Amino acid sequence: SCLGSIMNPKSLTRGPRDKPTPLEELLPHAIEFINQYYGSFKEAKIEEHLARLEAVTKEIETTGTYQLTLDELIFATKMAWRNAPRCIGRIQWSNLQVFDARNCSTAQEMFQHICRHILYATNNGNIRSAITVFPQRSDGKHDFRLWNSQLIRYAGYQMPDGTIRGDAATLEFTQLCIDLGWKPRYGRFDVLPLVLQADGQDPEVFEIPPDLVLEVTMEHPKYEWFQELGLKWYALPAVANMLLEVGGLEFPACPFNGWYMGTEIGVRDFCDTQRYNILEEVGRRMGLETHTLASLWKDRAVTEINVAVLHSFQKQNVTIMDHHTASESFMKHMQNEYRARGGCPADWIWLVPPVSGSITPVFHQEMLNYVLSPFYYYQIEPWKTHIWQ
Amino acid sequence: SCLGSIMNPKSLTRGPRDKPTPLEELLPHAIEFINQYYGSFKEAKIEEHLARLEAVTKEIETTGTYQLTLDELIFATKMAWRNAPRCIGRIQWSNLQVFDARNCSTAQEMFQHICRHILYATNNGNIRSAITVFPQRSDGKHDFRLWNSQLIRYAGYQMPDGTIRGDAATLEFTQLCIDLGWKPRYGRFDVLPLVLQADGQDPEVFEIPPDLVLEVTMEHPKYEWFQELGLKWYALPAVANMLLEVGGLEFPACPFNGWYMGTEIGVRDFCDTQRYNILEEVGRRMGLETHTLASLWKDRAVTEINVAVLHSFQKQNVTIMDHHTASESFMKHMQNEYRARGGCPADWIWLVPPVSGSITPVFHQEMLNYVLSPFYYYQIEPWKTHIWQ
Amino acid sequence: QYVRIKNWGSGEILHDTLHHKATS
Amino acid sequence: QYVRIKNWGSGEILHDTLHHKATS
Ligand code: HEM
Ligand code: HEM
Ligand SMILES: Cc1ccc([N+](=O)[O-])c(Oc2ccc(C[C@@H](N)C(N)=O)cc2)c1
Ligand SMILES: Cc1ccc([N+](=O)[O-])c(Oc2ccc(C[C@@H](N)C(N)=O)cc2)c1
Ligand SMILES: C[C@H](O)[C@H](O)C1CNc2nc(N)[nH]c(=O)c2N1
Ligand SMILES: C[C@H](O)[C@H](O)C1CNc2nc(N)[nH]c(=O)c2N1
Numbered sequence: 001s002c003l004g005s006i007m008n009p010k011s012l013t014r015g016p017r018d019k020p021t022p023l024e025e026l027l028p029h030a031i032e033f034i035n036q037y038y039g040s041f042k043e044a045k046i047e048e049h050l051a052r053l054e055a056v057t058k059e060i061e062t063t064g065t066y067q068l069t070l071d072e073l074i075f076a077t078k079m080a081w082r083n084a085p086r087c088i089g090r091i092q093w094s095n096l097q098v099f100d101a102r103n104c105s106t107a108q109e110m111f112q113h114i115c116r117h118i119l120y121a122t123n124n125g126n127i128r129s130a131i132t133v134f135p136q137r138s139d140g141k142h143d144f145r146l147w148n149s150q151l152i153r154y155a156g157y158q159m160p161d162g163t164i165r166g167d168a169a170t171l172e173f174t175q176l177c178i179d180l181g182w183k184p185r186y187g188r189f190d191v192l193p194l195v196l197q198a199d200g201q202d203p204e205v206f207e208i209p210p211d212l213v214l215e216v217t218m219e220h221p222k223y224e225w226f227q228e229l230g231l232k233w234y235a236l237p238a239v240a241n242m243l244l245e246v247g248g249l250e251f252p253a254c255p256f257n258g259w260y261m262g263t264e265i266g267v268r269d270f271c272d273t274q275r276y277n278i279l280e281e282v283g284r285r286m287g288l289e290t291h292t293l294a295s296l297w298k299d300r301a302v303t304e305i306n307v308a309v310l311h312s313f314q315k316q317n318v319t320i321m322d323h324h325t326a327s328e329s330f331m332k333h334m335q336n337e338y339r340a341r342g343g344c345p346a347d348w349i350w351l352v353p354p355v356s357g358s359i360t361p362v363f364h365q366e367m368l369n370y371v372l373s374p375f376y377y378y379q380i381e382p383w384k385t386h387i388w389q
Numbered sequence: 390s391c392l393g394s395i396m397n398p399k400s401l402t403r404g405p406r407d408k409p410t411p412l413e414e415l416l417p418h419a420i421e422f423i424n425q426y427y428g429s430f431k432e433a434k435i436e437e438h439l440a441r442l443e444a445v446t447k448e449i450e451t452t453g454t455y456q457l458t459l460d461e462l463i464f465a466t467k468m469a470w471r472n473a474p475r476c477i478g479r480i481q482w483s484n485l486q487v488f489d490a491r492n493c494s495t496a497q498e499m500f501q502h503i504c505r506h507i508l509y510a511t512n513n514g515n516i517r518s519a520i521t522v523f524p525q526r527s528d529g530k531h532d533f534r535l536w537n538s539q540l541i542r543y544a545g546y547q548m549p550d551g552t553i554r555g556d557a558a559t560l561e562f563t564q565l566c567i568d569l570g571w572k573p574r575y576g577r578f579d580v581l582p583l584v585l586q587a588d589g590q591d592p593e594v595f596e597i598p599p600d601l602v603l604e605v606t607m608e609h610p611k612y613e614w615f616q617e618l619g620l621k622w623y624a625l626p627a628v629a630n631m632l633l634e635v636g637g638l639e640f641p642a643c644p645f646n647g648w649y650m651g652t653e654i655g656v657r658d659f660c661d662t663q664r665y666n667i668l669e670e671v672g673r674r675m676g677l678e679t680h681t682l683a684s685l686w687k688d689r690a691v692t693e694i695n696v697a698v699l700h701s702f703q704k705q706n707v708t709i710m711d712h713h714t715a716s717e718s719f720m721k722h723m724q725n726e727y728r729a730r731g732g733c734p735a736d737w738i739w740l741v742p743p744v745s746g747s748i749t750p751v752f753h754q755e756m757l758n759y760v761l762s763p764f765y766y767y768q769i770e771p772w773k774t775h776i777w778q
Numbered sequence: 779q780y781v782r783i784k785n786w787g788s789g790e791i792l793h794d795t796l797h798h799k800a801t802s
Numbered sequence: 803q804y805v806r807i808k809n810w811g812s813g814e815i816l817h818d819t820l821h822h823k824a825t826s
Contacts, residue, residue, distance in 0.1 A: 001759035001797040004393035005737040007786065267747050273787055279748070293713040294699060298748045299692045307685050324682040335816075342804075343820020348394040348738060354747035358656050359668070359687045363743065364811035370390035370824040390821040396810065662811055724792075731780075732796020753787035759800040 004349060004369070014243045014250060014377035016385050017140030020064050026248040030056050030066060033247025033374070037075050065138065067102075068249065074098045076246035077131045077256070080374035086350035088326045088362075089258050091333035096256075097121075097130035104134050104144065107196045107204040110253075114194055115212060117255060118151055122214045122236055127259040127319035133244065134253035135199070144253040145382050147195035147203050149173070151238035151255055152213050155190040166190060169275055176383060180205050189215075189232055197382060202389045216316050220308040225285055229278065233265045233309075235318045241381075246374035256376075259319040261326045266306040267354045278305070302355060323353035327360040334365070345370045393738060393758070403632045403639060403766035405774050406529030409453050415637040419445050419455060422636025422763070426464050454527065456491075457638065463487045465635035466520045466645070469763035475739035477715045477751075478647050480722035485645075486510075486519035493523050493533065496585045496593040499642075503583055504601060506644060507540055511603045511625055516648040516708035522633065523642035524588070533642040534771050536584035536592050538562070540627035540644055541602050544579040555579060558664055565772060569594050578604075578621055586771060591778045605705050609697040614674055618667065622654045622698075624707045630770075635763035645765075648708040650715045655695040656743045667694070691744060712742035716749040723754070734759045 003009060020026075034056055038049035059066045068076065074096075082093040097120065101113040113132055121130045134144040155174045156166040164171065166188050174192065178184050182193050182205055191213050197203040214235040220226030238257035243250055270276045280290060282301045289295035306322075313320035321329075330351065337344040346367035357363050392398060409415075423445055427438035448455045457465065463485075471482040486509065490502040502521055510519045523533040544563045545555040553560065555577050563581065567573050571582050571594055580602050586592040603624040609615030627646035632639055659665045669679060671690045678684035695711075702709035710718075719740065726733040735756035746752050780793040804817040 001734070001757040001781070001794070001800055002391060002393050003757060003781070004391050005735075005754075005756040005758070007755065007784075271748060272753075274753075274789075293717075294711045296692060296696050296699070296711065296713075298713065299695065299745050302745070302748055303685060303688045303692065306688065310683060310685070322683045322685065324685075324687065328682075338816045338818070341820055343818045345390070345820075346394075352746070354752065355745060356688050356691070357741070357746050358743035359660060359691055361811055364661075364663075365394075365809045366396065366807045367394040368390040368392060368805060368807060368818050368821055369394070370821045372820070372823055373825055375825075390805070390818070390824055392805070396808075663813075727792045727794070730796055732794045734796075750787055754785045755783045757781060757783060757794050757797055759797045761796070761799055762801055764801075 004347075008378055011371065012378055013380070014245055015380050016143070017137060017250075020139055021248060021250075023060060023064060026065070027057065027060055029248030029373075030060060033072075033076075036079070037072055040075065066249070067136075068246070070098075070100055073100065073102075073133060073246075076374045077133065077244065077254075080244055080246065080376050081256075083345055083372040083375055085345040085347035085369045085371070087258075088261065088330045088351055090344075091329045091336075092129060092258070093333075095129055097128060099130065099132040101132055101134050102136065105199060107198040107201070107206075110134065110144065110146075110196045110198050111194060111204075111206040114146075114151065114196075114255065115209060117257075118208065118212045118236065118238070121238070121257050122212065125214060125235065125316065125318040127235065127257075129256075129258045131254060131256035133251050135251075137250040137252050142200040143197075144199060145197040145203075145379075145386075146240040146253055146255060147173070147176075147197060147382050148192065148240045150240045151194070151257070152208065152234040152236055153192045154234075155184070155187070155192050157184060157186055159186075167269075167275060177205065182207075188230075191234070197386070203382070203386070214318065216312050216318050218308050218312050219315075220304060221311045223285075223304070223308075226308050229281065229285075231270070231276075231278070233269065235260070235313070237264065241379060243377045243379050244374065245377055252379060254376075259321060260313070261321045261323055261353075262306055262310045262313070263323045263353050263355055266309040267302060270305055270309075271302055306355070323356060324360060327353065327362045331361045331365065343368070345372055393736075397767055400760065401767055402769070403634055404769050405532070406526060406639075409528055410637060410639075412449060412453060415454070416446065416449055418637030418762075419449060422461075422465075425468070426461055429464065455638070456525075457635070459487075459489055462489065462491075462522060462635075465763045466522065466633065466643075469633055469635065469765050470645075472734055472761040472764055474734040474736035474758045474760070476647075477650065477719045477740055479733075480718045480725075481518060481647070482722075484518055486517060488519065488521040490521055490523050491525065494588060496587040496590070496595075499523065499533065499535075499585045499587050500583060500593075500595040503535075503540065503585075503644065504598060506646075507597065507601045507625065507627070510627070510646050511601065514603060514624065514705065514707040516624065516646075518645075518647045520643060520645035522640050524640075526639040526641050531589040532586075533588060534586040534592075534768075534775075535629040535642055535644060536562070536565075536586060536771050537581065537629045539629045540583070540646070541597065541623040541625055542581045543623075544573070544576070544581050546573060546575055548575075556658075556664060566594065571596075577619075580623070586775070592771070592775070603707065605701050605707050607697050607701050608704075609693060610700045612674075612693070612697075615697050618670065618674075620659070620665075620667070622658065624649070624702070626653065630768060632766045632768050633763065634766055641768060643765075648710060649702070650710045650712055650742075651695055651699045651702070652712045652742050652744055655698040656691060659694055659698075660691055695744070712745060713749060716742065716751045720750045720754065732757070734761055 056066050117132045154167045156168045156171040159165050194206045195203050215232050218231040237260050240255045243252050244254045271279045283290040283297050288297035334344050347369040348367045351362050445455050506521045543556045545557045545560040548554050583595045584592050604621050607620040626649050629644045632641050633643045660668045672679040672686050677686035723733050736758040737756045740751050780795045784791045804819045808815045
């Protein structure tokens with residue numbers, strides 16, 4: 001049975017190791033990557049190409065592993081991007097900023113690199129795509145991990161009076177956070193602390209410097225009561241827990257970010273029943289027939305919450321993108337791609353906006369989803385495998 | 390590469406034959422079906438069960454084929470329904486009406502059965518689910534086929550002045566129709582003729598008796614100019630070109646129908662650029678910012694066209710269903726099903742409405758798509774394989 | 779065996795066993 | 803070979819050859 005509809009298929013996950021990765025597999029992978037890279041240069045360099053092939057082979061045998069040239073890493077992070085079946089923004093693949101923190105060693109050094117990142121990328125609202133590569137997995141017992149699903153994310157508490165406050169999606173991580181000594185500010189929009197694990201050590205908590213988390217206060221351009229819902233969201237979508245695989249190497253810590261596509265905050269974060277779940281309150285406050293589904297009131301509401309989100313980001317000068325423009329963009333990417341290298345790994349179930357499905361062009365496009373390399377994999381949640389001091 | 394996003398995968402098609410189907414494969418399939426059937430009876434009948442198993446085996450060997458008991462066919466049509474990965478209405482699976490036309494022989498006899506069907510099912514607007522099984526494929530050279538994609542469908546012409554009028558989706562079938570002697574009425578909503586092929590003979594055309602095609606005139610409940618768009622649609626969704634496979638047997642002709650889910654006419658038929666494509670005219674006539682995609686005007690328009698469609702069907706007393714109710718319905722079906730037999734072949738890419746994606750519950754449900762039996766397959770278009778007199 | 783299927787809206791899970799009867 | 807991929811909106815088709823480089 002085609003399992004296309006599963007969220008975290010094993011095929012897409014790259015789990016924990018206990019010992020270096022077998023040279024039998026590591027070597028041919030590395031040769032593959034090096035060929036990819038030199039092969040990418042318009043105008044080749046066989047001298048250099050051959051030299052590198054050799055150098056790497058040596059190192060791998062003299063050390064059972066190898067290190068990438070900063071140039072190769074910059075090429076790895078983008079290709080990995082380029083090969084992300086579930087991203088609509090890939091038309092921007094070649095435009096990434098890479099922060100090489102491969103020489104990091106402590107958690108506080110991590111906490112600093114992440115801050116340099118959050119700051120570089122936010123740019124006072126003019127968002128820039130960036131990535132921060134930490135030390136590559138070596139023996140699997142010294143892995144660098146970020147226990148957060150994403151850099152800036154809001155906490156989710158379970159109130160005394162039984163009601164859940166904040167983002168229910170993070171109720172569990174939040175407890176853990178609290179278990180590790182974080183002071184719960186019991187809000188609806190409390191930015192979660194960075195929980196960092198460096199060189200295999202138990203995880204360490206760090207509050208994100210408030211000045212660094214840019215936020216957008218939600219207000220609709222016709223409805224004055226929108227603002228009364230006292231809603232807001234962070235401007236930076238930064239995925240924090242994925243693994244970068246390139247030429248046999250695995251970087252278990254490599255936060256990356258882009259800008260937002262409105263429907264994420266719009267439809268998913270706010271409207272999902274298992275998230276901020278604000279669809280009824282917005283329905284009611286619109287006078288809609290909130291008690292008859294056939295009235296299509298949800299379709300009606302959600303579009304306004306979407307206009308609010310977009311309106312707010314534009315008004316505040318924060319970068320954002322609507323799903324339509326996103327889709328036409330991806331469509332053009334896909335064509336560049338088929339022309340450029342005849343193919344584009346694409347996952348329709350993800351590439352199609354969560355609203356306005358068929359009004360969007362990607363809905364009518366047949367796609368082939370396949371995992372290439374380099375690639376960004378998922379990982380088992382650390383607290384599930386981590387061995388404590 | 391998972392090819393989940395392809396429309397007509399071979400896996401889902403059951404093509405033409407040239408000779409009976411090999412007893413080696415036909416027999417074990419038949420035994421499987423018979424066991425399924427007797428196995429379905431609450432309170433068994435092993436006597437009968439065993440007797441049938443034997444009877445069928447005989448027949449198959451004495452004739453290289455076999456015939457189903459009307460009871461078995463009634464069970465085949467529903468199970469096939471029950472096992473239609475791409476249908477949201479399966480909660481209604483056990484409620485089908487079966488018209489046994491297995492003794493048909495001529496095209497005019499077909500044209501009559503179809504009319505009995507179109508009439509039984511329309512019911513003056515209170516739609517009833519029904520199916521009409523024609524003679525099963527025998528040697529593959531005497532197949533009964535309906536060349537239409539669906540019973541009632543509108544024609545699509547290519548105007549002199551270069552412009553395409555009617556439903557562009559059927560421009561090709563329409564030509565053929567014309568090539569076979571049909572008189573083009575050059576309208577925007579001209580019901581296409583039934584093109585029937587019986588017992589392997591060349592296809593024959595028949596106009597559907599106008600009194601039989603119930604139609605719904607489109608009018609919005611706030612916008613008076615909606616009616617000025619002079620739009621309408623047929624009330625009966627009847628798939629005409631699929632193959633029913635049961636216990637090794639193949640019925641290449643078996644039209645079936647249900648009622649409509651608003652978004653089909655709403656979003657797909659009217660809004661798809663390659664269909665009636667009315668999204669801009671509705672945008673403009675709403676004063677929306679039809680020239681800035683970020684204005685979300687399409688999301689805005691399409692929801693009104695959807696309210697129009699639903700409003701019209703209710704006002705005219707024709708059966709229809711909105712996508713939300715459809716989705717909650719399918720969700721309940723799925724659970725009955727997992728409880729009833731632990732599984733439900735479901736194709737997410739199809740089961741999710743073309744609008745309001747994530748606002749719908751099926752969007753958040755993981756599904757496993759697999760082909761069971763009995764099943765309704767697709768077929769190669771007749772005019773592509775048919776051998777002419 | 780059986781495939782673990784989950785509903786992210788309600789956290790609910792189901793165990794699909796019927797796929798076994800899938801045709802080739 | 804290559805997989806024929808089609809766009810039902812524009813009737814356009816593309817031939818995917820890159821999948822060959824798929825990992826297992
Ligand atoms: C131009 C800025 C970007 C935009 C507008 C964008 C947009 C999106 C969207 C809308 C999604 C679907 C997300 C969801 O359903 O949660 C997505 C997923 C994804 N994007 Fe991006 N993206 C951007 C930049 C990037 C970059 C620079 C990379 C590679 C370094 C990347 C890698 C990914 C991956 C791995 C996923 C899947 C995450 C998961 O499986 O949960 N994106 N992106
Ligand atoms: C209760 C009335 C019914 C409703 C509301 C309903 C609704 C739907 C919908 C919305 C679709 C997706 C269609 C598309 O994208 O074009 C669909 C597809 C389908 N339905 Fe139904 N359905 C009904 C009855 C039935 C029955 C009675 C059968 C079995 C005899 C059936 C078999 C199918 C099949 C085979 C498809 C796929 C057609 C294709 O692949 O093009 N449906 N249905
Ligand atoms: C890089 C990037 C660029 C752009 C977007 N975006 O536009 O929405 C991204 O979104 C996300 C946000 C969160 C997740 C999942 C994450 N929270 C957790 N595993 O659940 C996935 C994609 C990510
Ligand atoms: C039985 C049934 C019940 C209900 C619906 N419905 O609610 O939309 C159906 O729709 C359709 C209508 C047309 C097709 C495709 C057909 N025209 C052609 N191969 O392109 C598929 C499903 C079918
Ligand atoms: C996998 C499961 O079907 C789930 O509901 C989906 C589907 N499509 C998605 N598409 C995007 N972009 N993001 C998601 O989180 C999901 N989740
Ligand atoms: C298969 C290709 O992705 C195509 O655009 C789709 C997708 N999902 C669909 N879902 C339904 N219900 N009906 C369709 O015709 C399609 N077509």
